[PDB]
DNA sequence: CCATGTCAAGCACTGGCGGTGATACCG
DNA sequence: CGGTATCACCGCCAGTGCTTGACATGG
């Protein structure tokens, strides 16, 4: 019952770009949704929910996926990439 | 054997049992995924899933 | 099924360090738990929970706190800051398009 | 041919993230 | 009074465990 609330159009676009990178590179990187999931500490269906726009990406998982797929986060989600940059500003000890 | 038995101790008894049955350690036959499935009451695919998780589990420590 | 999970020891420390930074700089910055919550879009029980070790920090709230309090994240949580930098490596590396 | 194994997608289910808000308490 | 403390309560969804339908392949 009680179907899961749909993500935002932007999130859905993020996911579609993510999956497309995945499909395009899986052979040469030698990945399956399953093997990707393992590198991320999770299961196959969990990774799948992310690729198919069912579950939202967070910054942590996006970064993980970018590293696994060997692409920049900017290639699937610009808004998550900006969010990560925003957080990075906060590790900067800056001048006196 | 025991180094093995205690080596299969980091996994759930179910994950361990799936491997032992696949590798013939319980009864002498290298059961198929379907056979192990029927043993555990689930499909061959879920046994495949479990086995993979178990192998990745003992190949990281 | 306890609705809330307890913090690890490291999470408690990060909290203490966080709180101490609030206590030390609240005056120069004209901050209250309340005013800090307002900057973060939550309530004062929200902030209190983070300052007191009731709720763990996450990367986003840590970055916010650090910006409100004018310090770097690693002054209260070196592990969260490491997580932040690693995440930023994924924005930097392997560009195309 | 098809038994065996692999992959990806869908869904019922739940731990715990990430808070809320009176109200009573402190200096 | 301006601040803080916690009690005291929980919606919600990201991820799980399993299934199903498609498909690849050595024998
Ligand atoms: Ca809010």
Tab-separated table of C-alpha atoms (C1' of nucleotides) and ligand atoms in Angstrom:
chain	number	residue	atom	x	y	z
A	1	UNK	CA	0.000	0.000	0.000
A	2	UNK	CA	1.009	3.644	0.716
A	3	UNK	CA	3.186	4.327	-2.315
A	4	UNK	CA	6.423	6.227	-1.976
A	5	UNK	CA	6.349	9.946	-2.645
A	6	UNK	CA	7.891	10.903	-6.014
A	7	UNK	CA	11.201	12.741	-6.004
A	8	UNK	CA	11.511	16.242	-7.588
A	9	UNK	CA	11.882	16.620	-11.309
A	10	UNK	CA	15.453	17.759	-10.748
A	11	UNK	CA	16.130	14.728	-8.626
A	12	UNK	CA	14.638	12.598	-11.325
A	13	UNK	CA	16.901	14.236	-13.867
A	14	UNK	CA	19.916	13.684	-11.611
A	15	UNK	CA	19.043	9.997	-11.404
A	16	UNK	CA	18.502	9.627	-15.118
A	17	UNK	CA	21.941	11.122	-15.835
A	18	UNK	CA	23.451	8.857	-13.129
A	19	UNK	CA	21.957	5.714	-14.560
A	20	UNK	CA	22.969	6.711	-18.099
A	21	UNK	CA	26.576	7.112	-16.991
A	22	UNK	CA	26.235	3.727	-15.277
A	23	UNK	CA	24.894	2.001	-18.394
A	24	UNK	CA	27.494	3.634	-20.586
A	25	UNK	CA	30.489	2.616	-18.450
A	26	UNK	CA	29.482	-0.590	-16.635
A	27	UNK	CA	31.132	-2.927	-19.163
A	28	UNK	CA	34.570	-1.310	-19.138
A	29	UNK	CA	34.508	-0.657	-15.376
A	30	UNK	CA	33.170	-4.180	-14.882
A	31	UNK	CA	30.325	-3.242	-12.615
A	32	UNK	CA	26.861	-4.602	-11.772
A	33	UNK	CA	24.314	-2.800	-9.619
A	34	UNK	CA	25.268	-5.480	-7.152
A	35	UNK	CA	29.034	-4.867	-7.225
A	36	UNK	CA	28.546	-1.113	-7.019
A	37	UNK	CA	26.338	-1.596	-3.982
A	38	UNK	CA	28.975	-3.588	-2.235
A	39	UNK	CA	31.496	-0.810	-2.638
A	40	UNK	CA	28.976	1.423	-1.002
A	41	UNK	CA	28.046	-0.718	1.983
A	42	UNK	CA	24.645	-1.602	0.667
A	43	UNK	CA	22.521	-3.975	-1.354
A	44	UNK	CA	21.622	-4.177	-4.953
A	45	UNK	CA	18.076	-3.021	-4.635
A	46	UNK	CA	19.224	0.017	-2.742
A	47	UNK	CA	21.566	1.062	-5.446
A	48	UNK	CA	18.862	0.370	-7.958
A	49	UNK	CA	16.397	2.624	-6.228
A	50	UNK	CA	18.996	5.396	-6.598
A	51	UNK	CA	19.584	4.783	-10.295
A	52	UNK	CA	15.888	4.672	-11.128
A	53	UNK	CA	14.882	7.817	-9.289
A	54	UNK	CA	12.918	6.050	-6.539
A	55	UNK	CA	15.115	6.992	-3.587
A	56	UNK	CA	16.810	10.347	-3.253
A	57	UNK	CA	20.547	10.794	-3.604
A	58	UNK	CA	22.371	12.357	-0.722
A	59	UNK	CA	25.735	13.996	-0.990
A	60	UNK	CA	27.524	11.043	0.538
A	61	UNK	CA	26.063	8.498	-1.859
A	62	UNK	CA	26.561	10.791	-4.835
A	63	UNK	CA	30.199	11.137	-4.055
A	64	UNK	CA	30.592	7.458	-3.606
A	65	UNK	CA	28.972	6.835	-6.966
A	66	UNK	CA	31.114	9.395	-8.698
A	67	UNK	CA	34.225	7.758	-7.339
A	68	UNK	CA	33.024	4.243	-8.403
A	69	UNK	CA	32.025	5.363	-11.869
A	70	UNK	CA	35.072	7.589	-12.323
A	71	UNK	CA	33.170	10.726	-13.115
A	72	UNK	CA	32.635	14.062	-11.363
A	73	UNK	CA	29.507	14.563	-9.311
A	74	UNK	CA	28.877	17.489	-11.659
A	75	UNK	CA	28.176	14.964	-14.413
A	76	UNK	CA	24.892	13.811	-12.935
A	77	UNK	CA	23.931	16.303	-10.232
A	78	UNK	CA	25.082	19.932	-10.363
A	79	UNK	CA	23.014	20.816	-7.289
A	80	UNK	CA	24.592	18.121	-5.150
A	81	UNK	CA	28.032	19.195	-6.434
A	82	UNK	CA	27.370	22.759	-5.366
A	83	UNK	CA	26.098	21.551	-2.027
A	84	UNK	CA	29.335	19.604	-1.486
A	85	UNK	CA	31.355	22.685	-2.439
A	86	UNK	CA	29.391	24.708	0.039
A	87	UNK	CA	30.247	22.269	2.771
A	88	UNK	CA	33.935	22.181	1.714
A	89	UNK	CA	34.202	25.931	2.319
A	90	UNK	CA	33.642	25.085	5.916
A	91	UNK	CA	36.869	23.019	6.347
A	92	UNK	CA	38.921	26.017	5.309
A	93	UNK	CA	40.889	27.492	8.078
A	94	UNK	CA	41.541	30.719	6.385
A	95	UNK	CA	43.982	33.545	7.037
A	96	UNK	CA	44.657	35.311	10.365
B	1	UNK	CA	38.809	-27.345	8.764
B	2	UNK	CA	38.548	-25.615	12.144
B	3	UNK	CA	40.520	-22.669	10.804
B	4	UNK	CA	37.766	-22.631	8.083
B	5	UNK	CA	34.916	-23.299	10.582
B	6	UNK	CA	36.020	-20.387	12.757
B	7	UNK	CA	36.750	-18.575	9.485
B	8	UNK	CA	33.096	-18.939	8.538
B	9	UNK	CA	32.372	-17.190	11.853
B	10	UNK	CA	31.788	-13.540	10.999
B	11	UNK	CA	28.839	-14.409	8.853
B	12	UNK	CA	25.351	-15.304	9.878
B	13	UNK	CA	24.936	-19.003	10.347
B	14	UNK	CA	22.783	-18.825	7.283
B	15	UNK	CA	25.459	-17.240	5.072
B	16	UNK	CA	27.928	-19.794	6.306
B	17	UNK	CA	25.555	-22.641	5.721
B	18	UNK	CA	24.892	-21.465	2.164
B	19	UNK	CA	28.632	-21.595	1.406
B	20	UNK	CA	29.211	-25.003	3.031
B	21	UNK	CA	26.419	-26.497	0.992
B	22	UNK	CA	27.574	-24.921	-2.220
B	23	UNK	CA	31.116	-26.242	-1.637
B	24	UNK	CA	30.057	-29.746	-0.593
B	25	UNK	CA	31.216	-29.371	3.009
B	26	UNK	CA	27.974	-30.519	4.628
B	27	UNK	CA	27.149	-33.691	2.792
B	28	UNK	CA	29.624	-34.263	0.018
B	29	UNK	CA	27.641	-32.637	-2.835
B	30	UNK	CA	28.180	-29.215	-4.331
B	31	UNK	CA	24.583	-28.159	-4.328
B	32	UNK	CA	23.086	-25.865	-6.869
B	33	UNK	CA	21.589	-22.526	-6.047
B	34	UNK	CA	18.117	-24.020	-6.611
B	35	UNK	CA	18.812	-26.917	-4.222
B	36	UNK	CA	20.089	-24.549	-1.517
B	37	UNK	CA	17.122	-22.375	-2.226
B	38	UNK	CA	14.695	-25.193	-1.611
B	39	UNK	CA	16.551	-25.909	1.582
B	40	UNK	CA	16.098	-22.417	2.838
B	41	UNK	CA	12.694	-21.867	1.375
B	42	UNK	CA	13.725	-19.089	-1.044
B	43	UNK	CA	14.656	-18.770	-4.700
B	44	UNK	CA	17.946	-19.527	-6.415
B	45	UNK	CA	18.504	-15.834	-6.995
B	46	UNK	CA	18.297	-14.979	-3.288
B	47	UNK	CA	20.739	-17.719	-2.497
B	48	UNK	CA	22.983	-16.201	-5.188
B	49	UNK	CA	22.593	-12.913	-3.432
B	50	UNK	CA	23.431	-14.288	-0.037
B	51	UNK	CA	26.385	-16.256	-1.217
B	52	UNK	CA	27.857	-13.155	-2.824
B	53	UNK	CA	27.457	-11.155	0.293
B	54	UNK	CA	29.074	-13.934	2.263
B	55	UNK	CA	32.087	-14.253	-0.066
B	56	UNK	CA	32.626	-10.474	-0.004
B	57	UNK	CA	32.391	-10.727	3.745
B	58	UNK	CA	35.260	-13.165	4.195
B	59	UNK	CA	37.331	-11.486	1.468
B	60	UNK	CA	37.679	-8.121	3.207
B	61	UNK	CA	38.904	-9.168	6.648
C	1	UNK	CA	13.171	-0.082	17.125
C	2	UNK	CA	14.248	2.334	19.771
C	3	UNK	CA	13.340	5.376	17.741
C	4	UNK	CA	16.664	7.021	18.605
C	5	UNK	CA	20.108	5.525	18.442
C	6	UNK	CA	22.778	6.496	20.969
C	7	UNK	CA	25.844	8.384	19.844
C	8	UNK	CA	29.292	6.779	19.603
C	9	UNK	CA	31.956	8.087	21.897
C	10	UNK	CA	33.491	10.082	19.045
C	11	UNK	CA	30.144	11.680	18.251
C	12	UNK	CA	29.877	12.792	21.913
C	13	UNK	CA	33.207	14.449	21.794
C	14	UNK	CA	32.491	16.201	18.591
C	15	UNK	CA	29.437	17.510	20.393
C	16	UNK	CA	31.374	18.687	23.369
C	17	UNK	CA	33.860	20.456	21.255
C	18	UNK	CA	31.011	21.991	19.341
C	19	UNK	CA	29.301	23.203	22.457
C	20	UNK	CA	32.442	24.625	23.897
C	21	UNK	CA	32.946	26.662	20.764
C	22	UNK	CA	29.381	28.026	21.182
C	23	UNK	CA	29.980	28.945	24.815
C	24	UNK	CA	33.216	30.709	24.003
C	25	UNK	CA	32.041	32.776	21.076
C	26	UNK	CA	28.332	33.349	21.652
C	27	UNK	CA	28.960	36.799	23.048
C	28	UNK	CA	31.130	38.184	20.267
C	29	UNK	CA	28.733	36.662	17.743
C	30	UNK	CA	25.495	37.573	19.513
C	31	UNK	CA	24.235	34.014	19.338
C	32	UNK	CA	21.661	32.073	21.312
C	33	UNK	CA	20.612	28.395	20.747
C	34	UNK	CA	17.575	30.015	19.509
C	35	UNK	CA	19.234	32.390	17.108
C	36	UNK	CA	21.458	29.562	15.877
C	37	UNK	CA	18.449	27.382	15.329
C	38	UNK	CA	16.841	30.192	13.296
C	39	UNK	CA	19.958	30.424	11.098
C	40	UNK	CA	19.623	26.631	10.488
C	41	UNK	CA	15.892	26.341	9.924
C	42	UNK	CA	15.102	24.354	13.047
C	43	UNK	CA	13.998	24.830	16.667
C	44	UNK	CA	16.123	25.464	19.799
C	45	UNK	CA	15.555	21.856	21.039
C	46	UNK	CA	17.162	20.930	17.726
C	47	UNK	CA	20.369	22.813	18.490
C	48	UNK	CA	20.354	21.817	22.116
C	49	UNK	CA	20.225	18.192	21.017
C	50	UNK	CA	23.275	18.753	18.825
C	51	UNK	CA	25.169	20.715	21.458
C	52	UNK	CA	24.308	18.233	24.238
C	53	UNK	CA	25.067	14.894	22.509
C	54	UNK	CA	21.502	13.745	22.085
C	55	UNK	CA	21.570	13.834	18.306
C	56	UNK	CA	24.618	13.219	16.230
C	57	UNK	CA	25.946	15.794	13.845
C	58	UNK	CA	25.775	15.162	10.129
C	59	UNK	CA	28.017	16.825	7.468
C	60	UNK	CA	25.492	19.450	6.453
C	61	UNK	CA	24.665	20.635	9.973
C	62	UNK	CA	28.323	20.542	10.878
C	63	UNK	CA	29.196	22.772	7.938
C	64	UNK	CA	26.418	25.136	8.948
C	65	UNK	CA	27.497	25.330	12.513
C	66	UNK	CA	31.012	25.974	11.481
C	67	UNK	CA	29.897	28.804	9.275
C	68	UNK	CA	27.707	30.396	12.036
C	69	UNK	CA	30.433	30.069	14.629
C	70	UNK	CA	33.227	31.107	12.286
C	71	UNK	CA	35.494	28.135	12.748
C	72	UNK	CA	36.402	25.293	10.497
C	73	UNK	CA	34.495	21.963	10.906
C	74	UNK	CA	37.701	20.194	11.997
C	75	UNK	CA	37.830	22.294	15.125
C	76	UNK	CA	34.938	20.225	16.506
C	77	UNK	CA	34.799	17.153	14.239
C	78	UNK	CA	37.858	16.023	12.363
C	79	UNK	CA	35.986	12.997	11.048
C	80	UNK	CA	33.169	14.951	9.610
C	81	UNK	CA	35.608	17.316	8.014
C	82	UNK	CA	37.458	14.390	6.463
C	83	UNK	CA	34.144	13.184	5.094
C	84	UNK	CA	33.521	16.636	3.632
C	85	UNK	CA	36.880	16.832	1.863
C	86	UNK	CA	36.525	13.316	0.456
C	87	UNK	CA	33.187	14.214	-0.888
C	88	UNK	CA	34.728	17.292	-2.552
C	89	UNK	CA	37.351	15.121	-4.208
C	90	UNK	CA	34.505	13.546	-6.053
C	91	UNK	CA	33.425	16.895	-7.373
C	92	UNK	CA	36.994	17.758	-8.455
C	93	UNK	CA	38.132	14.500	-10.080
C	94	UNK	CA	37.220	13.023	-13.435
C	95	UNK	CA	35.380	15.879	-15.093
C	96	UNK	CA	33.914	15.513	-18.642
C	97	UNK	CA	30.916	16.789	-20.658
D	1	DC	C1'	17.206	-27.432	-25.130
D	2	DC	C1'	17.508	-26.017	-20.763
D	3	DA	C1'	19.712	-26.104	-15.902
D	4	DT	C1'	22.272	-23.073	-13.913
D	5	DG	C1'	23.641	-18.673	-13.025
D	6	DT	C1'	23.261	-13.612	-13.634
D	7	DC	C1'	21.152	-8.911	-13.698
D	8	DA	C1'	17.866	-5.328	-12.896
D	9	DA	C1'	13.432	-3.748	-11.253
D	10	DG	C1'	9.438	-3.654	-7.971
D	11	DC	C1'	7.341	-3.822	-3.464
D	12	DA	C1'	6.050	-4.553	1.741
D	13	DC	C1'	8.378	-3.401	5.459
D	14	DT	C1'	11.178	-0.813	9.372
D	15	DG	C1'	15.387	1.439	11.890
D	16	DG	C1'	16.601	5.352	13.084
D	17	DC	C1'	17.554	10.307	11.001
D	18	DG	C1'	16.524	14.295	12.298
D	19	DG	C1'	13.969	16.584	14.132
D	20	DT	C1'	9.289	19.096	17.100
D	21	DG	C1'	7.299	21.742	21.081
D	22	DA	C1'	5.242	22.461	25.338
D	23	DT	C1'	6.517	23.422	29.707
D	24	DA	C1'	9.533	23.841	33.795
D	25	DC	C1'	14.034	25.277	35.325
D	26	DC	C1'	18.417	28.569	35.946
D	27	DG	C1'	21.173	32.873	36.863
E	1	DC	C1'	13.246	37.698	32.004
E	2	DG	C1'	16.673	35.734	28.361
E	3	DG	C1'	18.459	31.387	27.914
E	4	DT	C1'	18.641	26.372	28.435
E	5	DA	C1'	17.129	21.907	29.502
E	6	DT	C1'	15.490	17.964	28.760
E	7	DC	C1'	11.430	15.412	28.940
E	8	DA	C1'	8.235	13.246	25.877
E	9	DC	C1'	6.815	12.296	21.304
E	10	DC	C1'	7.250	10.557	15.996
E	11	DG	C1'	6.800	11.160	10.457
E	12	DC	C1'	8.944	9.585	7.093
E	13	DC	C1'	11.882	7.409	3.696
E	14	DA	C1'	16.409	5.165	2.450
E	15	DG	C1'	17.726	0.828	2.390
E	16	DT	C1'	16.474	-4.237	3.086
E	17	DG	C1'	14.929	-8.938	1.773
E	18	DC	C1'	12.890	-11.073	-1.308
E	19	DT	C1'	10.549	-11.988	-5.738
E	20	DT	C1'	9.882	-11.834	-10.822
E	21	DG	C1'	11.004	-11.672	-15.786
E	22	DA	C1'	14.579	-11.460	-19.044
E	23	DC	C1'	18.525	-13.199	-20.584
E	24	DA	C1'	23.475	-15.694	-21.424
E	25	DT	C1'	25.880	-20.146	-21.920
E	26	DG	C1'	28.453	-24.652	-21.300
E	27	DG	C1'	27.118	-29.146	-21.826
F	1	LIG	CA1	13.689	22.791	9.109
